[PDB]
Each structure stands twice: as C-alpha cells, then as structure tokens.
Inverse folding.
C-alpha cells in the first residue's frame, strides 16, 4: 500500500481480523504494521495554500 | 492570524483602512523605512451622538453634492463558429 | 385533502358605507435574508493528481482548466466579501448608544450589545447564532479548503450596533448626512406622520405603543428561541454547500472505467505505458466533476448575490429611512426596522402599523351648506347616524366640519352622492 | 479607477476569448495539437483515435466558455435592469428611496453615456451646518395642546419657535401653524408657551 504521509500510533482498537482502515472519502486513514502488531494512523503531511 | 501565518509583514497596533484584504479582520498596507505592515482593519471614527429627551439638531445650511455612479449595461457580442473552432 | 386557499370573507361593500379603524396594534415581523456563503478553494492539482508526478504531467496536457477553475473560485470568494461589505457597511462612522435609556418607554436592551458577555452581540443575535449550526478533515486532506471571511462576526456585530444606535438616536438623518440628535418620541411622531396618521395619536398613546412594542419584541425572542425552523433559509444554504462538498469529495471513490479509484493502486501495479489509459480516464472523470461543481457554485453564488443585493436595498430603504412600498418592509404600514446579525445572513425586525378595530359608518363624498360643495382636505366625511364629522383615514378622530377643514369647489348639482349638512365657521 | 466596473467587464470578456484560444493549442492526450499534423501522418483508422480526443476536448472547452458567457450575461442583464430602473426613477422623476439615487436627499439626476455602460450624475441635498436646540412635543396656552402641522418646536434659550425639520427657519407660533388636539394632561414632556393669534 504505497503512500505518503506522517505515521502516528493510533488508539483505534482493531479487531484481530481488521487489517486496514478507510476514511469517509475512501482513503486509508489507518494501517496495521505486518511485523509489529500496532495500529498506525495515516495523516498526509502539512500543506496549504500560499 | 486566524487565516494563516503571515511572514514578511510587521505587526502594528494602529488601525488603518483595509487596503490589501488578508482575511479574518487583518489587512495589509505599504507604509513607513517603507515596509509592508499588517493590522486589524478599522470600521470608522467612533462617534457618540449626544442624545437627550429635550435636545434636537436642525441644520442651518446645506451643500449640493453631485455623486457619480457607473453601472454596466451591455457587453461585447461574440459569435463563435462551433464548427470552424473544432474542425478548422 | 385539497389545500384550502383561505377563509372566505365577504366584504360588505356599499356606495355609502365606510370602515375606519378606531384602534391599532404595533406588529413586529422578522425576515431572514442570506448575504453570503462559505468560501471554497479547491486545489485542482491535489484533487485530480494528489501526490503523483506522472498524473501531473498528463494533466498539464489538457490546458488551463485548473487555472480557470481556481480563477472562478477566487472570483466567488472575492464577490462574497464584496456583498458582505455592501450589505453591512452602509455607513462610514461607527455610532454608540448613550448610557441613559431615556427613549420614552421603548425597551431596546434586547437588541443592543451586552458588555457583560465577551462577544459584543445582543440576546437576539446570540439566539440566531445558536440556532444555526470528521468530514472537515477529509475535505481538507483532499484539497478542499475553506477560506475565512474578511469581516469577522465581531465586526458585523459592531456594524449592526452602529446602525441600530444611529437609527434610535437620529432616525433617518444619519444616512443622508451627519447624524442629527432627536428624541425617539419625535422620531415616532415623524414615522406616524409618514404613513398618514396624525402625530397626536402617538403623543396620546405613547404608553400603549411602548407596551405593545415591548410585548412584540418579547414574542419575537420567544419565537426565535422556541422553534428550530425560523432560520431555515440560512441552514438551507449551509446544507447545500456541505452536500456539494461531500459529493465532490466522494466522487474520488469512483473508477470511471479504470481498474481502481486510487492512483497509488495503479502506479504500483502497471507500468508507464499501460497505466496511461487508466490515469487519463480518472483525470477526465475528476475534471468533469470539478467543472460541474464549479458551475453549481457559480449559479449558487449568483443567487446569493441577488439575495445580498435585495438585502442591502431593504436595509437602505427600511433602516435608514421609511419606505412607502407596500409589503416591502414587512406587512403593514412600515414605521421603522432594526437590523440584526446572523450567520451568513441578515435579519430585520420590521415595525409595522396595523389597524385593529374598525367600525361601520355612513360616508358622503361632499357636503353642501349654502349652494357650495365642500370637500375634505385630509380625511373623509363620516356620520354616526345623526351628526356628520370629518376624520382622518387610518384612525377614528371625529372633528366638527369647519371652514378650516374643508375647501369649496363647484356646486351641489355636479357631485354624485352629496348630502346636506351645515359647515361651521370659526 | 472611476470606470473600473466597465474595465473589469471588458477585461473578462477579453480573457475568456484568450483562454479559449490558448486551450485550442492543447493536446488533450493526442500526439499533436495541430489537426493537419495528425491528419497527414497517421492512417484513417489511427487518425480518428486522436481526432475524437481533440474534438471532445475542444467541445468541452466550448461548452465551458458558453456556460461562463451565459452566467456573465445573466449578471449583465441584472445590472442593466437595475440601471434602467434607476434611470426611470431618478432621471424621469424624483425617487424618495433612501440611498438609491445617490447618498442624500435626491433632487435630480442626469444620465451620461459610457462605453458599454451608463453613468448617472446624482444630485443630492445634504445638510452641512447643524445646531443644538431644545425641543418639545407640544405647547400649552389655554389648557389645550398645540401640535405642529409641518415642523417641530425649538427653543433658543428664552423663546419658542416653529421651524421645518430639514432647515432652520424660526417663526412665531401662531394658530395657523399649529392645530389643537386633546388636552395638556396626557402628553409627556409638554411645556408652556403663548400661542399668537393673528
Ligand atoms: C452655507 O455655506 C456656504 C458655503 O460655505 C456659505 O457660502 C459662503 O459664505 C461666506 C460668507 O458670506 C463667503 O465668504 C463665501 O465666499 C461663501 N462661499 C460660497 C462657495 O459661496 C454660506 O454663506 C452658508 N450659509 C449660511 C447661512 O451661513
Ligand atoms: C386598543 O387595543 C389595546 C390592546 O387590546 C387596548 O389596551 C387594552 O385595553 C383593555 C381595556 O381597556 C385593558 O384591559 C388592557 O389592559 C389593555 N392592554 C394594554 C396592553 O394596555 C386599548 O384599550 C384599545 N384602545 C381602545 C380605544 O379601545
Ligand atoms: C427592558 O427589559 C428587560 C427584560 O425584561 C429589563 O431587565 C429587567 O430588569 C429588572 C430590574 O433591573 C430585573 O429585575 C429583571 O430581572 C430584568 N430582566 C431580565 C430578563 O434580566 C429591563 O429593565 C427593561 N428596561 C427598562 C428600562 O426597564
Ligand atoms: C352621534 O354623535 C353625536 C355627537 O356627539 C351625538 O350627540 C350627542 O349625544 C350625547 C349622548 O347621546 C349627548 O350628551 C350630546 O348632547 C349630543 N350632542 C349634540 C350636539 O346633540 C349622538 O348621540 C351620536 N349618536 C349615536 C347614535 O352615536
Ligand atoms: C339639500 O337642500 C336642497 C335645497 O336646500 C334640496 O333641494 C330640494 O329638493 C327638493 C326635492 O327634490 C325639491 O322639491 C326642491 O325644489 C329643492 N330645492 C331647491 C332649492 O332646489 C335637496 O334635496 C337637499 N338634499 C338632501 C339630501 O336633503
Ligand atoms: C432667542 O431669539 C429671540 C428672538 O430672536 C431673541 O430675542 C431678541 O433678542 C434681541 C437681542 O437683544 C432683541 O434685539 C430682540 O428685540 C429680541 N426679540 C424679541 C421678540 O424678544 C433672544 O435674544 C434669543 N435668545 C438667545 C439666548 O439667543
Ligand atoms: C403650565 O400652566 C399650568 C396652568 O397655568 C400649570 O398648572 C398648574 O401648576 C401649578 C404648579 O404645579 C399647580 O399649583 C396648579 O394647580 C396647576 N393648574 C392646573 C389647572 O393644572 C402647569 O404647571 C404649567 N406647566 C409647568 C411646566 O409649570
Ligand atoms: C516476525 O513477524 C512477526 C509478526 O508476524 C513478529 O511477531 C516477530 O517479532 C517478527 N520477527 C522478527 C525477527 O522480525
Ligand atoms: C501592541 O500591544 C501589545 C499588547 O500590549 C504590546 O505587547 C505590543 O508591544 C504593542 N505593539 C506596538 C507596536 O505598540
Ligand atoms: C359592518 O357590517 C357588516 C355587514 O352587516 C358586518 O358583518 C360587520 O360586523 C359590521 N361591522 C362591525 C364593526 O360591526
Ligand atoms: C346606493 O345604492 C342603492 C342600492 O341600489 C341605491 O338605492 C342608492 O340610490 C345608491 N345611492 C347612491 C348615492 O348612488
Ligand atoms: C451639541 O451638543 C453636543 C454635546 O455637548 C456637542 O458635542 C455638539 O458640538 C453640540 N452642537 C453644536 C453645533 O455645537
Ligand atoms: C429627561 O431625562 C432626564 C435624565 O434622565 C430626566 O432627569 C428628565 O426628567 C427627563 N425629562 C423628560 C421630559 O422626560
């Protein structure tokens, strides 16, 4: 699942069969690391208009 | 500011007329040495009418003023050839 | 059921019967008008080609679609602030209410700002702001940003307070030039004289008029605090903008004929020669969605601009003056109006003069005393059965028919329906 | 910057055509932007693939331009209706509407022609020099209350006068200037003064 963003430890309690997690706009907002059984939030890096 | 982080303009406390609208009440101007400044836009001179239950103000003179007002009426016609534009 | 158009009311018309109200009731009505909507700044490159390089190179081949869309959105964002300024900044000098509330019985403490609360808004303004009410993060992450307005709520509240203070301390002279102080009693007398009612009615029933005004303001507050559908016009625009943003942000979950809706799912499986078709289909679909959204936003902005122009016209004609236009500044004979701030809108409190209790009387178009036809100067001839009088139109105040009340023109054999009655000579 | 409202309209009408001409030069995914370059290098079966893309792109551009022109024409029609209303009201008459025929009390207006627009020279009546005076709702002379017919009572400190609301012209309070209505026990703030009888 290629992407770009800032990773942060999530507090969402994923069930043992919950691998990924999508947002309202069909975008991955949470992912489970395959090696370490931890939930990580996917947030795009800081941006904005100039 | 509430709109964002403005970098390059000095923050002043004096309230002037909004020249360059930035957003969220902040505007920019080019004043004095010359540099861009940012300030909270003002609304006008704070006045206080001397109201009373037995006081009235009646004018003793008048000034005839002429104020211009420009209003658009029409625009330039354009007949684009829908066939020649795509299949010249 | 078949909808009823209203109760059937048969008017007792006659060639010699007239109805003149013997009382009146001051009625205060509210009107909600949108003035602006939420700004939108759609990052076209991040929406169509979010975090991609080849997608941007393919999108640059289409032309200046992103440029013109951003230009239209910037024009909308500028014209929204332009409308807000043209509506809420009709004066160039902020006024302030005097510390003494010696108006004559009228209670304006419910529409003037309260120094206790931090936000310099009145009670009605607080109610209106409370009656109008994560998707925001999802919209922001896809390139849909909302720009803040130029004038904050505090500045709009100060403008409304200045307009209200000018209206209550100077009447309508503050709009045509410098503010001229005048007691509120004389202001209401001028208002009554504007609608065709003699000023003595106010100077004789000022207590009743003030009580009715206070009761009307209280009922307006109770109605705004009880129901949740009085500010539906602004909530409608808010919900429409929210639904448009939601549709624009959910259109990204469509394939448009491609193998996947995510660009990373295509750039990680196909090469640089086969994924071109899928990326082109996605770009076409998203660009069509953006064009549709921009067209809808332009039409909605035109509607909001029309509404804001109407609101500014109503402000200038009802608050800064006394408009004689029927059903414009509320239903009834307009006396005065007070503006009120509202989220992305304006609310007026139109004070109107409404007759209450009318009675049947016998009328005559003219009166002949010594072979000369007499016509009322300002009023109409009435008869209570035995005697004849002359009274104003919008109020029952009988007076003796004298030479100073009627003028002579013609003779008796020319007017149809003329009766005989003596004309007093002072 | 006096004719900025017309300058902006002209600039937008020119920029729309400029953007259309520039988008004419787009490729829209084809091998070239020029039609003759594609029609003279590829065979018919292979040329139609690019001709379809070019036609679709240019048709989308034309539709966008027509939609923008329709919206701008609706805005210009609204502005022209407003201008015609202002003409018929201020020029061909005297409108009592506040802040409609210029800021102030509208006296008259003179129309002026402008490129793709109209200019109105609104003449307004604005009071300049005001003075403070002591006012009163009515006058008590012989138990009755005297209300002004057209004007308001003023006092310069010692005497009472009656003058119009928009200009200071003091006159003696006579029976021909004020009318009698009611008594002098219900009016709030009433005062005492003599009423002259001619
Ligand atoms: C109303 O204002 C005008 C303009 O200020 C006054 O006209 C001036 O009067 C002074 C005194 O006589 C002259 O010296 C000026 O030359 C006048 N100016 C113009 C442009 O005519 C006018 O006098 C004022 N009216 C009153 C009653 O004070
Ligand atoms: C005009 O209508 C008002 C409102 O109904 C009348 O005021 C009421 O009059 C009744 C009877 O005189 C009183 O019992 C109420 O207390 C009054 N209400 C208020 C708020 O003052 C008024 O009397 C009517 N005028 C005439 C001439 O009948
Ligand atoms: C205008 O109306 C308000 C609200 O009815 C009045 O505020 C009341 O004032 C009294 C006396 O100070 C208090 O006992 C009440 O609790 C107040 N009401 C509220 C809701 O706070 C106010 O006094 C009125 N204005 C005038 C000049 O009397
Ligand atoms: C119609 O109005 C006249 C004028 O007021 C009434 O005449 C007066 O009536 C009262 C009581 O009935 C008497 O005290 C007065 O002396 C009468 N005035 C005169 C000049 O005669 C008359 O009664 C009214 N009629 C009706 C049916 O209301
Ligand atoms: C008003 O008075 C005139 C005369 O003062 C009345 O005219 C009379 O009408 C009767 C009936 O038609 C005739 O017989 C008389 O010859 C008329 N007199 C004159 C001098 O022409 C008139 O009828 C009265 N109007 C009303 C409504 O009573
Ligand atoms: C208020 O106005 C009256 C009327 O103009 C002034 O009375 C005049 O005062 C002058 C100055 O002494 C006398 O020459 C006149 O004879 C007075 N006229 C009358 C009818 O009494 C009065 O002085 C003014 N008061 C103030 C304070 O300006
Ligand atoms: C206006 O004049 C009337 C009568 O000339 C005054 O009324 C009198 O006032 C005095 C003092 O208050 C009382 O002793 C009398 O009984 C009153 N007479 C009547 C018939 O009411 C009135 O006070 C004067 N106005 C002012 C402001 O002084
Ligand atoms: C191998 O992966 C498992 C999870 O599948 C993890 O628990 C374990 O620690 C990993 N071991 C090493 C040596 O990385
Ligand atoms: C503006 O006011 C703040 C608050 O007291 C103060 O810290 C700051 O120095 C002021 N700036 C200027 C330029 O006076
Ligand atoms: C006037 O007459 C009509 C018809 O007789 C009647 O319906 C109406 O109630 C009358 N008006 C009053 C005030 O009684
Ligand atoms: C009013 O109408 C009635 C009913 O037809 C008629 O008898 C009477 O003469 C009319 N009066 C006038 C002045 O027209
Ligand atoms: C009227 O009185 C107020 C309050 O004292 C004052 O500010 C104003 O200047 C006065 N008007 C004139 C014309 O002097
Ligand atoms: C006017 O207001 C002052 C201050 O409250 C008061 O003393 C005076 O009695 C009032 N006069 C009238 C006529 O209301």
């Amino acid at each position: 699942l290629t992407g770009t963003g800032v990773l942060t430890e999530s507090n969402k309690k994923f069930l043992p069969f919950q691998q990924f997690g999508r947002d309202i706009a069909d975008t991955t907002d949470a992912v489970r690391d395959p090696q370490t059984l931890e939930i990580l939030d996917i947030t795009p890096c800081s941006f904005g208009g100039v | 500011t509430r709109a964002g982080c403005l970098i390059g303009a000095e923050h002043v406390n004096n309230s002037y007329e909004c020249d360059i609208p930035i957003g969220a009440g902040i505007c920019a101007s080019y004043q004095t040495s010359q540099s861009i400044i940012a300030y909270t836009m003002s609304l006008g001179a704070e006045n206080s009418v001397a109201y009373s239950n037995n006081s009235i103000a009646i004018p003793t003179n008048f000034t005839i003023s002429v104020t211009t007002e420009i209003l658009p009426v029409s625009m330039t016609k354009t007949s684009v050839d829908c066939t020649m534009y795509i299949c010249g | 059921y078949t909808m009823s158009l209203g109760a059937e009311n048969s008017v007792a018309y006659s060639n010699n019967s007239i109805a003149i109200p013997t009382n009146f009731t001051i009625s205060v009505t509210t009107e909600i008008l949108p003035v602006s909507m939420t700004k939108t700044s759609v990052d076209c490159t991040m929406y169509i080609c979010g975090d991609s390089t080849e997608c941007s190179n393919l999108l640059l081949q289409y032309g200046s679609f992103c440029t013109q869309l951003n230009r239209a959105l910037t024009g909308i964002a500028v014209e929204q602030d332009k409308n807000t300024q043209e509506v809420f900044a009709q004066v160039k000098q902020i006024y302030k209410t005097p510390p003494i509330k010696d108006f004559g019985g009228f209670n304006f403490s419910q529409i003037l700002p309260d120094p206790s609360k931090p936000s310099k808004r009145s009670f009605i303004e607080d109610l209106l702001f409370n009656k109008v009410t994560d998707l925001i993060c999802a919209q922001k992450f896809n390139g849909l940003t909302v720009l803040p307005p130029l004038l904050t709520d505090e500045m709009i509240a100060q403008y409304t307070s200045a307009l209200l203070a000018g209206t209550i301390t100077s009447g309508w002279t503050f709009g045509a030039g410098a503010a001229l102080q005048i007691p509120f009693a004389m202001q209401m007398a001028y208002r009554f004289n504007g609608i065709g009612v003699t000023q003595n009615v106010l100077y004789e029933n000022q207590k009743l008029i003030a009580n009715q005004f206070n009761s009307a303001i209280g009922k307006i507050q109770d109605s705004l605090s009880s129901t949740a559908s009085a500010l539906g016009k602004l909530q409608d625009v808010v919900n429409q903008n929210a639904q448009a943003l939601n549709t624009l942000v959910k259109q990204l979950s469509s394939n448009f004929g491609a193998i996947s809706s995510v660009l990373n799912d295509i750039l990680s499986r196909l090469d640089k020669v086969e994924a071109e078709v899928q990326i082109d289909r996605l770009i076409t679909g998203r660009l069509q969605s953006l064009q549709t959204y921009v067209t809808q936003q332009l039409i909605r902005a035109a509607e909001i601009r029309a509404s804001a122009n109407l609101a500014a016209t109503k402000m200038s004609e009802c608050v800064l003056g006394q408009s004689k236009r029927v059903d414009f500044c509320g239903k009834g004979y307009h006396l005065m109006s007070f503006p009120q701030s509202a989220p992305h809108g304006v609310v007026f409190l139109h004070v109107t003069y409404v007759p209450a209790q009318e009675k049947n009387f016998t009328t005559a178009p003219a009166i002949c005393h010594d072979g000369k036809a007499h016509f009322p100067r300002e009023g109409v001839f009435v008869s209570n059965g035995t005697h004849w009088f002359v009274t104003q139109r919008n109020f029952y105040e009988p007076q003796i028919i004298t030479t100073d009340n009627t003028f002579v023109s013609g003779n008796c054999d020319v007017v149809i329906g003329i009766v005989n009655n003596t004309v007093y000579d002072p």
